[PDB]
Design a protein around this motif. Structure first.
Motif, mmCIF file in Angstrom:
data_model
loop_
_atom_site.group_PDB
_atom_site.id
_atom_site.type_symbol
_atom_site.label_atom_id
_atom_site.label_comp_id
_atom_site.label_asym_id
_atom_site.label_seq_id
_atom_site.Cartn_x
_atom_site.Cartn_y
_atom_site.Cartn_z
ATOM 1 N N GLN A 128 0.647 -1.235 -0.011
ATOM 2 C CA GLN A 128 -0.023 -0.045 0.018
ATOM 3 C C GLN A 128 1.055 1.059 0.015
ATOM 4 O O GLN A 128 0.525 2.262 -0.742
ATOM 5 C CB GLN A 128 -0.966 0.175 1.176
ATOM 6 C CG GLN A 128 -2.343 -0.572 0.833
ATOM 7 C CD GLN A 128 -2.262 -1.972 0.086
ATOM 8 O OE1 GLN A 128 -1.568 -3.186 0.504
ATOM 9 N NE2 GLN A 128 -2.810 -2.036 -1.072
ATOM 10 N N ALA A 129 1.845 1.443 0.820
ATOM 11 C CA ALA A 129 2.693 2.382 0.733
ATOM 12 C C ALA A 129 3.527 2.660 -0.423
ATOM 13 O O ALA A 129 4.023 3.789 -0.729
ATOM 14 C CB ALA A 129 3.802 2.225 2.044
ATOM 15 N N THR A 130 3.661 1.695 -1.165
ATOM 16 C CA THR A 130 4.631 1.844 -2.567
ATOM 17 C C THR A 130 3.469 1.678 -3.736
ATOM 18 O O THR A 130 4.184 1.706 -5.082
ATOM 19 C CB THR A 130 5.520 0.814 -2.598
ATOM 20 O OG1 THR A 130 5.104 -0.360 -2.483
ATOM 21 C CG2 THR A 130 6.630 1.010 -1.570
ATOM 22 N N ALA A 131 2.295 1.451 -3.564
ATOM 23 C CA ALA A 131 1.152 1.492 -4.768
ATOM 24 C C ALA A 131 1.591 2.413 -5.639
ATOM 25 O O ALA A 131 1.561 2.165 -6.888
ATOM 26 C CB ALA A 131 -0.082 1.415 -4.029
ATOM 27 N N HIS A 132 1.763 3.589 -5.387
ATOM 28 C CA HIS A 132 2.249 4.906 -6.260
ATOM 29 C C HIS A 132 3.412 4.676 -7.269
ATOM 30 O O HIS A 132 3.576 5.431 -8.193
ATOM 31 C CB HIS A 132 2.048 6.052 -5.334
ATOM 32 C CG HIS A 132 3.390 6.373 -4.429
ATOM 33 N ND1 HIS A 132 3.591 5.550 -3.355
ATOM 34 C CD2 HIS A 132 4.407 7.371 -4.588
ATOM 35 C CE1 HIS A 132 4.534 5.717 -2.621
ATOM 36 N NE2 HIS A 132 5.120 6.893 -3.416
ATOM 37 N N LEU A 133 4.288 3.875 -6.619
ATOM 38 C CA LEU A 133 5.596 3.464 -7.419
ATOM 39 C C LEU A 133 5.327 2.480 -8.213
ATOM 40 O O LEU A 133 5.454 1.426 -8.010
ATOM 41 C CB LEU A 133 6.581 3.309 -6.309
ATOM 42 C CG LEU A 133 7.054 4.323 -5.414
ATOM 43 C CD1 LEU A 133 8.044 3.946 -4.372
ATOM 44 C CD2 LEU A 133 7.419 5.587 -6.094
ATOM 45 N N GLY A 134 5.278 2.466 -9.773
ATOM 46 C CA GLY A 134 5.148 1.677 -10.813
ATOM 47 C C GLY A 134 5.979 0.545 -10.745
ATOM 48 O O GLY A 134 5.532 -0.690 -10.601
ATOM 49 N N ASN A 135 7.288 0.703 -10.769
ATOM 50 C CA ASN A 135 8.518 -0.201 -11.111
ATOM 51 C C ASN A 135 8.874 -0.906 -9.605
ATOM 52 O O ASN A 135 10.007 -1.508 -9.603
ATOM 53 C CB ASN A 135 9.648 0.419 -11.599
ATOM 54 C CG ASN A 135 10.137 1.366 -10.884
ATOM 55 O OD1 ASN A 135 10.841 2.169 -11.284
ATOM 56 N ND2 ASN A 135 9.454 1.659 -9.667
ATOM 57 N N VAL A 136 8.175 -0.870 -8.575
ATOM 58 C CA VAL A 136 8.268 -1.409 -7.349
ATOM 59 C C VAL A 136 7.237 -2.822 -7.181
ATOM 60 O O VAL A 136 6.301 -2.526 -7.443
ATOM 61 C CB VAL A 136 7.985 -0.392 -6.170
ATOM 62 C CG1 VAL A 136 8.312 -1.114 -4.717
ATOM 63 C CG2 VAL A 136 9.234 0.581 -6.229
ATOM 64 N N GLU A 137 8.017 -3.852 -6.897
ATOM 65 C CA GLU A 137 7.422 -5.180 -6.662
ATOM 66 C C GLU A 137 7.629 -5.565 -5.042
ATOM 67 O O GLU A 137 8.979 -5.978 -4.848
ATOM 68 C CB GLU A 137 7.903 -6.061 -7.677
ATOM 69 C CG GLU A 137 7.175 -7.386 -7.497
ATOM 70 C CD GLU A 137 7.827 -8.513 -8.386
ATOM 71 O OE1 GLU A 137 7.530 -9.707 -8.149
ATOM 72 O OE2 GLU A 137 8.763 -8.312 -9.078
#
Ligand SMILES: CC(C)(COP(=O)(O)OP(=O)(O)OC[C@H]1O[C@@H](n2cnc3c(N)ncnc32)[C@H](O)[C@@H]1OP(=O)(O)O)[C@@H](O)C(=O)NCCC(=O)NCCS
Ligand SMILES: CC(C)(COP(=O)(O)OP(=O)(O)OC[C@H]1O[C@@H](n2cnc3c(N)ncnc32)[C@H](O)[C@@H]1OP(=O)(O)O)[C@@H](O)C(=O)NCCC(=O)NCCS
Ligand SMILES: CC(C)(COP(=O)(O)OP(=O)(O)OC[C@H]1O[C@@H](n2cnc3c(N)ncnc32)[C@H](O)[C@@H]1OP(=O)(O)O)[C@@H](O)C(=O)NCCC(=O)NCCS
Ligand SMILES: CC(C)(COP(=O)(O)O)[C@@H](O)C(=O)NCCC(=O)NCCS
Ligand SMILES: CC(C)(COP(=O)(O)O)[C@@H](O)C(=O)NCCC(=O)NCCS
Ligand SMILES: CC(C)(COP(=O)(O)O)[C@@H](O)C(=O)NCCC(=O)NCCS
Lengths: 158, 157, 158, 157, 157, 158
Positions: F56-65
């Motif tokens: 949830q905290a990185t949802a805005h970050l595209g290329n983050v898995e």
């Protein structure tokens, strides 16, 4: 004449420890590789195992005597008539901790002089702690251990 | 067993005396070797530093004071030393010592570096600090051998 | 006017702590020596014992008030109206840890200013942790402790 | 309660202002003392540094800016100070501070060294860093008092 | 993705080669940028250092060697770099690196500092150390690219 | 092309971690935020919770898995075909520890290059450990956590 003591938990003994004790035997007449019997946290290898592994790994070293000890290192050192205390200083060592330790040991037994030796660059960044943890979690640590220790470690983790 | 304790010793302080004394209780012969170190623009000439160190260590039977201007490792080999003494203070100077130690080991692998720890009393002093205080007329009697204090006062008089 | 707080576990209080609190009383009007009630790891001495030992060891110090506290130090400091936070910095201190702590405490209570004092060279290399461990293992630590603490420690380990 | 905050302040930066401000909230009177430090070949003369510091701290009522060329400890005793303020940044400079602190304590045991910590904003700046950036025409407006920035620009113009 | 690896490189050592090689395996193009650094009184002129670095990195296809005398951050922006490479040795130099990194970030926020770690073999060497040893005729062949060793010997001959 | 891995316990993920992973996504094509499944000490949040919060905290970050992993990080990295290992270096980091870790990881998987990134000054002095401990003891840590983590932490401690 000169009797030195190189104390630790050696759980297990590594190539870094072999490096340091070898350098120590080159400058002092007799070196006692002293293994702490009951470390705070339960060691991976029993005192018996640690002594056996250390003895085999240093068998080629003439003036090295592997011995286990309990309670205060300084008290053992005094009864063993050691006047030199060997400490290995890796590049990743907690230097301030070593200073604390050396001053406490000096307070306890001033006739015991702390001397710090430096391992080769090869073993300057590894600790027994990291080795055990990597091994426990399926990582290859063969490179950092004497062959006899490697074999014992595989049996221990199996 | 011959050890060499190299340094600029500009000037030799009670801290250096502490370290060299510990060295003599551990090894048969100790060579206190003073580097010319022209690039450091020493306060005292090499000749003066040797004289000061000689007097300051006159009471130590197995100490030999010598000056040198060549590569420390070559001087050590030529002095037949197999132990290299370094003092480690209550400072994180440990980093710099490792660089020096590894370079010297590369130059002369049989010269084993050994680090000794001074008493608490001398754990925070340095030749540089003493000189700075003396340049401002502060009392540094406590940190220096009697002969050295006299020489420093006269040097700055 | 100026109220300072010198918090810790003081398990047990040592000459190093006495050194720091004494220096603090010389620059601030009132100093609260605050003893943490329930530290993460079970202390050697109970809060009651630690407070008693600390009170006796600082009885000669007028403007020193020994008090126990639980939960957040910052919350206690705020309710006690302290505006100065005393931290002792030994030569063997984990400086980066002190910076972490000071910034967290500043975030929590900005009106509480962290000030670091330095002990004498005599107590600059010893910690309560090392003292306890050496004592537990039959080493002489009399030198680092106020007489009342020494007596209590012998009883504790007997 | 009088405290002294000594330093080269070449030039005084927002970091120094942060530290001296914390000092004033803790002690009745604070003497910001600028050392001549000729051996450091300061960019600004002592006279200029004092003037800059004076203006930069004009808003701080209990701060007094003075210059000195003698032993800091003697100057402190002569200023009737009993507290010595030092700032500790996000660097391991702590080691050097202990050496200085212990020397000053030896020179004047009643002068108690106290270390203050700057805000995160100024935890990585230094006079040296600002000067280096300015020597290459980089923008250092953010790190200096308005009057100091003006003086630095003019000094390097 | 363009990265810049700035430094004095006086001279470029095997340690620098180690770091720049790691950088090339990570980024498309690497600009090895040599600062004039007149205030450091370099042994080699900027022109010499660039030539030495060029030859020493001739085998590295995506490395471009350039010299500069302006603000590193402006040079980086002008080179269209978005990554700033720094090497971190077995020393606590980390403190100084943070100061530099934060200043550069203030000057150019889009220039991301990245720290790489050299092999154990080069973890204790520096240009300064090599020069000091060579000034005393010690063997530094092991720490330098062949062309650089030749240049250093000739420079001190 | 370039696949990087940013491993840790993220118990819980903080603004400091978000800062580092964001910088990483700006220089590398794909970033795997890898969460250790079973850390030595029992985490405050379960792996399931930690993964959910991190996602949830990185949802805005595209290329983050965001992905969980057990055993050796290096073994996971190898199977995931990562060639870059992201480590965040705060101003209060145990640098010598990071060197130990990087060299061990290099020994294990030389094709995995350690790269250290620096967080903003704002998050340079805080750790997940300190945050948890302050929170557990009634201190305000809202500032250091993404809103979703803050809400989860309040529920966890209630
Ligand atoms: C007995 C002795 C020689 C064993 O040596 P040892 O195996 O190195 O034991 P340590 O606990 O120091 O473990 C070594 C590493 O643990 C870590 N460590 C241990 N205690 C630490 C502490 N309080 N803070 C930080 N790190 C610590 C350090 O990283 C250290 O290595 P480093 O200094 O190079 O970075 C040593 O503990 C000693 O001299 N102890 C003094 C008191 C004593 O006599 N022991 C009790 C009797 S049972
Ligand atoms: C309450 C408090 C003042 C007690 O101080 P304290 O007795 O010094 O407690 P510490 O845990 O820091 O123990 C001191 C030593 O332990 C060691 N230590 C503790 N945590 C450590 C960590 N995470 N990493 C490394 N060393 C650590 C250090 O060596 C330290 O001394 P040093 O900085 O000089 O080298 C301090 O813990 C505090 O201000 N805590 C903030 C949060 C809080 O309010 N406590 C929780 C409420 S119950
Ligand atoms: C998996 C991994 C990436 C997780 O990272 P992580 O969350 O940072 O875990 P760490 O244990 O290092 O915790 C971080 C902090 O704990 C502290 N810490 C942990 N072990 C420490 C030790 N032995 N001494 C001192 N501090 C220690 C440090 O402060 C550290 O932060 P810092 O370097 O910035 O100051 C890392 O543990 C790793 O790469 N491990 C190698 C072996 C492995 O693969 N793990 C085992 C498999 S289950
Ligand atoms: C004098 C000294 C031991 C440093 O000691 P110092 O810090 O006490 O002045 C060192 O600079 C030295 O060895 N000088 C001789 C020239 C040399 O061989 N330098 C290379 C050292 S690796
Ligand atoms: C100026 C300063 C406080 C150092 O501060 P700086 O690092 O901010 O320049 C110090 O060099 C000093 O005290 N100078 C005066 C001369 C002196 O007494 N020196 C001995 C100090 S122990
Ligand atoms: C050359 C270097 C990268 C430092 O590297 P070095 O220690 O390898 O010599 C630095 O001094 C620099 O960036 N110089 C250019 C002038 C500048 O912009 N200085 C401000 C840096 S914040």
């Amino acid at each position: 004449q000169k009797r030195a003591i190189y104390p630790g938990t050696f759980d297990p003994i590594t190539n870094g420890h072999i490096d340091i004790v070898t350098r120590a035997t080159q400058m002092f007449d007799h070196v006692i590789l002293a293994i702490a019997a009951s470390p705070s946290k339960k060691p991976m290898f029993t005192l018996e195992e640690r002594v056996a592994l250390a003895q085999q790994a240093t068998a080629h070293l003439g003036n090295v005597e592997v011995v286990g000890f309990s309670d205060l290192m300084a008290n053992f050192a005094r009864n063993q008539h050691a006047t030199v205390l060997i400490r290995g200083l890796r590049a990743v060592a907690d230097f301030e901790y070593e200073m604390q330790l050396a001053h406490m040991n000096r307070h306890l037994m001033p006739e015991l002089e702390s001397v710090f030796l430096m391992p080769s660059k090869e073993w300057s960044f590894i600790s027994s702690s990291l080795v055990k943890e990597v091994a426990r979690h399926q990582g290859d640590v063969t490179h950092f251990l004497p062959e006899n220790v490697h074999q014992a470690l595989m049996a221990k983790l199996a």
